[PDB]
């Protein structure tokens, strides 16, 4: 069982704000209960599945397209610039609503909402539902907010650990170049020693020639 509570403005009573509480299960097409209230009285009507078909057929509109217009008008899920006008007569207890365009108005529904005997019981249940919903929402806030504090601390752990891989890798590549130079200098020191050995041999040869004759 679902429900939706929406704020509307009747042109019969334009000064204040009314409320529509539409409840259905599991889809809006299979019928729904609709209630109008001004914080004092309450009018409730049950729109069956057959009445939804009849309302669409009497205006030659495809059902699926019409049921889609109920959700847009009664469940506060449309526009801008989807304009809707709502009428209610407390004498006949008929609820009228229509979608207004610049050149044509589609009379979408005419529902009979008989006045309830105890409107306070309905208003209280409506407020209990809103308070329960607020409590559920703030619980999902705290549970989702907690997942980000964990997801961001998992990210901060990887960030600090990967920068240790980068520093270790750099310290490795530095030690590889140090080991390469230390060995390269030994081989240059050996070549330099062989050069002096070749130089010494040629010098000690000239002495042996100048003395032997």
């Amino acid at each position: 069982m679902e429900r939706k509570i929406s704020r509307i403005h009747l042109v019969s009573e334009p000064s204040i704000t009314h409320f529509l509480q539409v409840s259905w299960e599991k889809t809006l097409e299979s019928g729904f209960v609709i209630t109008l209230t001004d914080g004092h009285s309450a009018w409730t009507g049950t729109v069956s599945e057959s009445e939804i078909s009849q309302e669409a057929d009497d205006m030659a509109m495809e059902k699926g397209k019409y049921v889609g217009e109920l959700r847009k008008a009664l469940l506060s899920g449309a526009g801008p610039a989807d304009v809707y006008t709502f009428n209610f007569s407390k004498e006949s207890c008929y609820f009228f609503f229509e979608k207004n365009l610049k050149d044509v108005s589609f009379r979408l529904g005419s529902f009979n909402l008989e006045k309830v005997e105890n409107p306070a019981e309905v208003i209280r249940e409506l407020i209990c539902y809103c308070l329960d919903t607020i409590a559920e929402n703030q619980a999902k806030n705290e549970h989702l907010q907690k997942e980000n504090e964990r997801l961001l601390r998992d990210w901060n752990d990887v960030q600090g650990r990967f920068e240790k891989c980068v520093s270790a890798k750099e310290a490795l590549e530095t030690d590889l170049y140090k080991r390469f130079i230390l060995v390269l200098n030994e081989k240059k020191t050996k070549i330099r020693s062989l050069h002096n050995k070749l130089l010494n041999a040629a010098q000690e040869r000239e002495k042996d020639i100048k003395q032997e004759g």
Partner: protein, 77 residues
């Protein structure tokens, strides 16, 4: 003529000459043997140098190995 004198003094010369060549060809053999056994000892040291040089690289990369494994433990979860 002194026949035995000539035959003996000549026999003693060929024995002296062949022995001199005998020792010389033995020394030349030892010289080539010492040449190969030295060249083999240097190729053997060059091979252990090539081994220790690789074993030293593995010993230095252990620090990076530990860090990379530690990081993949935090990510594969």
């Amino acid at each position: 003529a002194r026949s035995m004198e000539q035959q003996e003094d000549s026999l003693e010369k060929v024995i002296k000459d062949t022995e001199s060549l005998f020792k010389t060809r033995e020394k030349e053999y030892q010289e080539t043997i010492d040449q190969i056994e030295l060249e083999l000892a240097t190729a053997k040291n060059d091979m252990n140098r090539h081994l220790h040089e690789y074993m030293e690289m593995c010993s230095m990369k252990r620090g990076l190995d530990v860090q990379m494994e530690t990081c993949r433990r935090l990510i594969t979860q």
